[PDB]
Coordinates of C-alpha atoms in Angstrom, one line a residue:
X1 CA -1.4 18.5 62.1
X2 CA -1.0 22.2 61.9
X3 CA -3.3 25.3 61.3
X4 CA -2.8 28.7 59.7
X5 CA -5.2 31.7 60.1
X6 CA -5.1 35.5 59.2
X7 CA -5.6 37.9 61.9
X8 CA -7.0 41.5 60.9
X9 CA -6.8 44.8 63.0
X10 CA -10.2 45.7 64.3
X11 CA -9.6 49.5 63.3
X12 CA -7.2 51.8 61.9
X13 CA -5.1 52.0 65.1
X14 CA -4.4 48.2 65.6
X15 CA -6.3 48.6 68.7
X16 CA -6.9 44.7 68.6
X17 CA -6.7 42.0 66.0
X18 CA -9.5 39.5 65.2
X19 CA -9.1 36.0 63.9
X20 CA -12.0 33.9 62.5
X21 CA -12.8 30.7 64.4
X22 CA -15.2 27.8 63.4
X23 CA -17.2 26.7 66.4
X24 CA -19.9 23.9 66.2
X25 CA -21.5 21.6 63.6
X26 CA -22.5 23.1 61.2
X27 CA -19.8 25.7 61.7
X28 CA -20.6 29.0 63.3
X29 CA -17.7 31.5 62.4
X30 CA -16.8 34.1 65.2
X31 CA -14.1 36.5 65.0
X32 CA -12.2 36.1 68.3
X33 CA -9.5 38.2 70.0
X34 CA -6.5 35.9 70.4
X35 CA -5.0 36.6 73.8
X36 CA -1.7 35.1 75.0
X37 CA -2.4 37.0 78.1
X38 CA -5.6 34.9 79.3
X39 CA -6.6 31.2 79.2
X40 CA -10.5 31.4 78.4
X41 CA -12.0 30.9 75.0
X42 CA -15.4 32.8 75.7
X43 CA -18.0 34.0 73.2
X44 CA -20.9 36.2 72.6
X45 CA -23.8 33.7 72.6
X46 CA -27.5 33.3 72.4
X47 CA -27.4 33.2 76.3
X48 CA -25.9 36.9 76.5
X49 CA -28.1 39.5 78.1
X50 CA -29.7 41.0 75.0
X51 CA -28.9 44.5 75.9
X52 CA -25.3 43.7 76.1
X53 CA -25.1 42.5 72.5
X54 CA -24.5 45.3 70.0
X55 CA -23.6 44.0 66.6
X56 CA -21.5 41.0 67.6
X57 CA -21.9 37.5 66.0
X58 CA -23.2 35.0 68.6
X59 CA -22.8 31.4 69.1
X60 CA -26.0 29.4 69.5
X61 CA -25.0 26.1 71.0
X62 CA -28.7 24.8 70.4
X63 CA -28.0 24.9 66.8
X64 CA -24.6 22.9 66.9
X65 CA -25.2 19.1 66.9
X66 CA -21.8 18.5 68.7
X67 CA -22.4 21.1 71.4
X68 CA -22.9 19.6 75.0
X69 CA -23.5 21.5 78.2
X70 CA -20.7 21.1 80.7
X71 CA -23.0 20.6 83.5
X72 CA -22.4 22.8 86.5
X73 CA -19.5 24.6 85.2
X74 CA -19.4 28.5 85.4
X75 CA -16.8 31.0 84.5
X76 CA -16.0 34.6 85.5
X77 CA -13.1 36.6 84.2
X78 CA -11.8 40.3 84.9
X79 CA -9.0 41.7 82.6
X80 CA -6.2 44.1 83.3
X81 CA -8.3 46.9 81.6
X82 CA -11.4 46.6 84.1
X83 CA -13.3 44.7 81.6
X84 CA -15.1 41.4 82.5
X85 CA -17.6 38.6 81.4
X86 CA -19.3 35.5 82.9
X87 CA -21.3 32.7 81.8
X88 CA -21.7 28.8 81.5
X89 CA -19.9 26.5 79.6
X90 CA -20.3 24.1 76.6
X91 CA -18.0 21.7 74.9
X92 CA -17.9 21.7 71.3
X93 CA -15.7 21.4 68.0
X94 CA -13.5 24.4 67.5
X95 CA -11.3 24.7 64.4
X96 CA -8.8 27.5 63.7
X97 CA -7.2 27.9 60.2
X98 CA -7.8 24.3 59.6
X99 CA -6.8 22.8 62.9
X100 CA -9.6 21.1 64.8
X101 CA -10.2 20.3 68.3
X102 CA -13.0 18.3 69.6
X103 CA -14.3 18.7 73.1
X104 CA -13.1 22.2 73.5
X105 CA -14.6 24.3 76.4
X106 CA -16.5 27.1 74.8
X107 CA -17.3 29.5 77.5
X108 CA -20.7 31.2 76.7
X109 CA -21.1 34.8 77.9
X110 CA -24.3 35.5 79.9
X111 CA -22.9 38.9 81.0
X112 CA -20.3 41.2 79.4
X113 CA -19.0 44.5 80.5
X114 CA -19.7 47.6 78.7
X115 CA -16.4 47.7 76.7
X116 CA -17.3 44.5 75.1
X117 CA -20.8 45.4 74.1
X118 CA -19.3 48.7 72.7
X119 CA -16.8 46.9 70.3
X120 CA -19.0 45.3 67.7
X121 CA -16.0 43.8 66.0
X122 CA -14.8 41.4 68.8
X123 CA -17.1 38.2 69.2
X124 CA -15.0 36.8 72.2
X125 CA -11.6 36.0 73.1
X126 CA -9.4 32.9 72.5
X127 CA -6.9 32.5 75.6
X128 CA -3.5 31.3 74.6
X129 CA -1.7 31.8 78.0
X130 CA -1.3 28.8 80.3
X131 CA -4.2 26.7 81.3
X132 CA -3.6 27.2 85.0
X133 CA -5.1 30.6 84.5
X134 CA -8.4 29.2 83.1
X135 CA -11.5 30.5 85.3
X136 CA -13.7 27.7 84.7
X137 CA -15.2 26.3 88.1
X138 CA -15.4 23.7 89.5
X139 CA -13.3 21.7 86.9
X140 CA -10.7 24.0 85.3
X141 CA -10.5 23.7 81.4
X142 CA -7.6 23.6 79.0
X143 CA -6.9 26.2 76.1
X144 CA -7.2 25.4 72.5
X145 CA -3.6 25.2 72.2
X146 CA -3.1 22.9 75.1
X147 CA -5.8 20.5 73.7
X148 CA -4.2 20.7 70.2
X149 CA -0.6 20.3 71.2
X150 CA -0.2 16.6 71.2
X151 CA -1.6 16.3 67.6
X152 CA 0.6 19.3 66.2
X153 CA 3.7 18.5 64.3
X154 CA 5.5 20.6 66.7
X155 CA 4.2 21.9 70.1
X156 CA 4.4 25.6 69.1
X157 CA 2.1 28.5 67.8
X158 CA 3.6 31.7 66.3
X159 CA 2.2 35.3 66.3
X160 CA 3.0 37.5 63.1
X161 CA 1.0 40.7 63.7
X162 CA 0.8 43.4 61.1
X163 CA 1.3 47.1 61.3
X164 CA -1.8 48.5 59.9
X165 CA -2.2 45.4 58.0
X166 CA -3.2 41.8 58.4
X167 CA -1.1 39.0 59.9
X168 CA -1.0 35.1 60.8
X169 CA -1.3 33.0 63.6
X170 CA 0.2 29.5 62.8
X171 CA -0.3 26.3 65.1
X172 CA 2.3 23.5 64.8
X173 CA 4.9 24.7 62.7
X174 CA 7.4 27.9 62.1
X175 CA 7.1 29.4 58.6
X176 CA 10.7 30.0 57.9
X177 CA 9.8 32.6 55.2
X178 CA 8.0 34.9 57.5
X179 CA 11.0 36.3 59.3
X180 CA 14.5 37.6 58.4
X181 CA 17.8 36.4 60.2
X182 CA 17.6 34.1 63.0
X183 CA 15.1 33.4 65.8
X184 CA 16.4 34.1 69.1
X185 CA 14.9 32.0 72.1
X186 CA 14.8 33.1 75.6
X187 CA 13.5 31.6 78.8
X188 CA 10.0 31.6 80.0
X189 CA 8.5 31.5 83.5
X190 CA 5.2 30.0 83.9
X191 CA 4.7 30.7 87.6
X192 CA 2.1 33.5 86.9
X193 CA 0.5 31.6 84.0
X194 CA 1.8 34.0 81.7
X195 CA 4.5 33.8 78.8
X196 CA 6.8 35.8 81.1
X197 CA 10.4 36.4 80.0
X198 CA 13.2 39.1 80.7
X199 CA 14.3 41.3 78.1
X200 CA 17.9 42.4 78.1
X201 CA 17.5 46.1 77.8
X202 CA 16.5 48.9 75.6
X203 CA 17.5 51.9 73.3
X204 CA 15.7 55.0 72.3
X205 CA 16.0 56.1 68.6
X206 CA 19.6 56.1 67.6
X207 CA 20.8 56.2 71.2
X208 CA 23.1 53.7 73.0
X209 CA 21.7 50.5 74.2
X210 CA 21.1 50.3 78.0
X211 CA 21.6 46.8 79.4
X212 CA 19.1 46.1 82.1
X213 CA 16.8 43.2 82.9
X214 CA 13.0 44.1 82.1
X215 CA 10.8 40.9 83.3
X216 CA 7.3 41.1 81.4
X217 CA 4.9 39.2 79.5
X218 CA 4.2 38.6 75.8
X219 CA 0.5 39.6 75.5
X220 CA -1.2 39.7 72.2
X221 CA -4.4 40.9 74.0
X222 CA -3.0 44.2 75.2
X223 CA -2.6 46.8 72.8
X224 CA 0.4 48.9 74.0
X225 CA 3.8 48.5 75.4
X226 CA 4.0 49.0 79.2
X227 CA 7.4 49.4 80.8
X228 CA 8.8 50.8 83.9
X229 CA 8.4 54.5 84.4
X230 CA 12.3 55.2 84.1
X231 CA 12.3 53.5 80.6
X232 CA 9.2 55.2 79.3
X233 CA 10.5 58.8 80.7
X234 CA 13.5 58.1 78.8
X235 CA 11.6 57.6 75.5
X236 CA 9.2 60.4 75.7
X237 CA 11.9 62.9 76.9
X238 CA 13.2 62.6 73.3
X239 CA 9.8 63.8 71.8
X240 CA 9.4 67.6 71.9
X241 CA 6.1 68.5 74.0
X242 CA 5.5 65.0 75.1
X243 CA 4.1 64.8 78.7
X244 CA 2.4 62.5 81.0
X245 CA -1.3 63.5 81.2
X246 CA -3.1 62.4 84.6
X247 CA -6.6 63.4 83.0
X248 CA -6.0 61.4 79.6
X249 CA -4.4 58.5 81.4
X250 CA -0.8 58.4 80.0
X251 CA 1.7 60.0 78.0
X252 CA 0.5 62.2 75.0
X253 CA 2.5 64.1 72.4
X254 CA 1.9 66.7 69.7
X255 CA 0.5 65.1 66.7
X256 CA 3.0 67.2 64.5
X257 CA 5.8 65.1 66.1
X258 CA 8.0 62.5 64.3
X259 CA 8.6 59.6 66.9
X260 CA 11.8 57.9 67.5
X261 CA 12.0 54.3 67.3
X262 CA 12.2 51.9 70.5
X263 CA 14.6 48.8 70.6
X264 CA 14.2 46.1 73.2
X265 CA 16.7 43.2 73.8
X266 CA 16.2 39.5 73.4
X267 CA 19.2 37.9 74.6
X268 CA 22.0 39.5 72.4
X269 CA 19.4 40.2 69.6
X270 CA 17.5 43.4 69.2
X271 CA 14.0 44.1 68.0
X272 CA 13.4 47.7 66.6
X273 CA 9.8 49.0 67.0
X274 CA 9.6 52.0 64.2
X275 CA 8.5 55.3 65.7
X276 CA 5.2 55.2 63.7
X277 CA 4.1 51.9 65.4
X278 CA 4.0 54.2 68.8
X279 CA 1.5 56.7 67.5
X280 CA -2.1 55.9 68.7
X281 CA -3.6 59.0 67.0
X282 CA -5.5 62.0 68.5
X283 CA -6.8 61.5 71.9
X284 CA -10.3 62.6 70.7
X285 CA -11.4 63.4 67.4
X286 CA -9.9 66.5 65.9
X287 CA -7.5 66.9 68.7
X288 CA -3.7 67.9 68.0
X289 CA -2.7 65.8 71.1
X290 CA -2.0 62.2 70.1
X291 CA -1.7 59.2 72.6
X292 CA 1.4 57.3 72.9
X293 CA 1.9 53.7 72.3
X294 CA 4.5 53.2 75.0
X295 CA 3.2 53.8 78.7
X296 CA 4.1 53.2 82.3
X297 CA 3.4 49.8 83.8
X298 CA 3.8 51.5 87.3
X299 CA 0.1 51.0 88.1
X300 CA -0.2 47.4 86.7
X301 CA 2.2 45.3 88.7
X302 CA 3.7 43.7 85.5
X303 CA 5.5 45.0 82.3
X304 CA 3.5 44.1 79.1
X305 CA 4.9 43.5 75.8
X306 CA 1.9 44.1 74.0
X307 CA 1.0 44.4 70.3
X308 CA 3.2 47.6 69.9
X309 CA 6.0 45.4 70.7
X310 CA 5.0 42.0 69.2
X311 CA 4.1 43.5 65.8
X312 CA 7.5 44.4 65.2
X313 CA 8.6 40.6 65.5
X314 CA 7.9 37.3 64.4
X315 CA 7.2 35.5 67.8
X316 CA 7.3 31.9 68.6
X317 CA 5.3 30.6 71.5
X318 CA 7.2 27.3 72.2
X319 CA 5.0 24.9 74.3
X320 CA 7.6 22.2 74.8
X321 CA 7.8 20.7 78.2
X322 CA 10.0 23.6 79.2
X323 CA 8.4 26.5 77.2
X324 CA 10.4 29.3 75.7
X325 CA 9.6 32.3 73.4
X326 CA 11.4 33.2 70.3
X327 CA 11.8 36.5 68.6
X328 CA 12.9 37.5 65.1
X329 CA 13.0 40.5 63.0
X330 CA 10.6 40.5 59.9

């Protein structure tokens, strides 16, 4: 089997991407944030505290003839941005782009933190990291991809995120028309539960490539590119007037600037992020200070190849017995 679904930016900055997902019988379609940095499929629901729902579409398990309470199971998750959610668990039929999994754990939110409530466009998350990170207790549950894998034509999914435009998540096949050149594959460590790999270096604009190992994660659920402070300083030093602002929470730059590109290495190959992809617009409405799309990871504990980086590439998440990542230009 295969599946193919379009993923759409939630706003004009590509702050996140939503993908329609069918849950239950008859189908209830919710727009989920596919997140290769976590491993829970959770949804706003008829069980979510009413004051914490503000415009989201909810899953109502009592209206699904295939929903079953997973008795005794609870979940609770905290994300790197400080947001969180928790609740109980149903199993139900879940389909993405024509690919159907029966018995998928659907984690129903009883509580969500303010940033989820405040984002009316995201009805939940669909985790695509390794199932060892799944938070369901006392019986850990598998991701949608893990459940689908054996049925897929090939044990892979691909992320093809657009810049200010829709893109595609494919399951079970590699669309050879969706990229240019060849795909360069690179080793993955699953020791932390992430799609963790080592970039071979970087360049700023037309500058020379610096060969240096940068361990980080391919994370579709993180907006920006978070890299070591040395690398980030070297980038922003090429933008007149750019500075790190403790009050804003990162590097800002004059909105009048033209940003240089940023290149990252994948083995001997190179992925070029155009400068425009690094512009996240005014820090507040009407400001002439703009927020940068490349930020320091120093306070995180891990480097994160988020959407800013991934949207410059066609990315293969190879879930073979030994997982690997592939990157191609497009």
